[PDB]
Write a protein that binds this ligand. Structure first.
Ligand SMILES: O=C1C[C@@H](c2ccc(O)cc2)Oc2cc(O)cc(O)c21
Length: 208
């Protein structure tokens, strides 16, 4: 596939997440913004990479549907989130964020929606606690990146720019946390509609 450039940040077509050794391709990328006082403040640029094997898996079930169709289909993105393949997310900050600011916002989203499905055990709370522990002292100037590998486990890595380090920072062995992080971005209530549309556009075409 092709590379994508989002808000002056470049996402190449392939990456090598640090922990894994599988091949990944850029499924899509998009900005993430919030609405404050009449203005859409763009905070991050998100790149969603998928393991190569995701194309045959998704091609079987989502072939013959237009990009417009896939964007609305909620089960299409749930398959991207939960499929039996690795996912890698790059979150590059457009505006500066502290790790506490980032993890707290990640935290409530993940905890509340887990209460939606009545799957919130005391284990996920421990996963959340570790997640917050990873981010506690981190700071993320413009251009720095938060890297997530979602594996059938969540691997967390940090970079001061857009490059991928050779060694992660932490691994959290929880399947729901690893999935929630990605759901919070490209899910039904996903904070990056633009990443969803990029994913819809690029994967449907790949299915051809
Ligand atoms: O990429 C971001 C930005 C982050 C954020 C924005 C502004 C702010 O003040 C604090 C955090 O919120 C998020 C929350 C998520 O669940 C997943 C995400 O990818 C993100």
């Amino acid at each position: 596939v092709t590379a994508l450039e989002i808000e002056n940040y470049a996402f190449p077509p392939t990456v090598k997440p640090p922990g894994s050794t599988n091949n990944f391709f850029l499924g899509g990328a998009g900005e993430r913004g919030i609405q404050i006082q009449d203005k859409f403040v763009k905070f991050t640029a998100i790149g969603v990479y998928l393991q190569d094997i995701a194309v045959p898996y998704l091609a079987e079930k989502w072939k013959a549907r237009s990009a417009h169709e896939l964007t609305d289909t909620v089960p299409f993105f749930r398959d991207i989130v939960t499929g039996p393949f690795e996912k890698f997310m790059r979150v590059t900050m457009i505006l500066p964020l502290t790790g506490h600011q980032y993890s707290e916002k990640v935290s409530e989203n993940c905890v509340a929606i887990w209460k939606s499905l009545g799957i919130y055990t005391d284990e996920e709370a421990k996963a959340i606690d570790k997640f917050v522990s990873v981010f506690k002292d981190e700071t993320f100037p413009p251009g720095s990146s938060i890297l997530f590998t979602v594996s059938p486990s969540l691997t967390i890595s940090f970079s001061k720019d857009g490059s991928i380090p050779e060694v992660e920072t932490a691994v959290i062995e929880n399947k729901l946390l690893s999935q929630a992080v990605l759901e919070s971005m490209i899910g039904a209530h996903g904070v990056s509609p633009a990443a969803k549309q990029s994913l819809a556009s690029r994967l449907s075409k790949l299915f051809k």
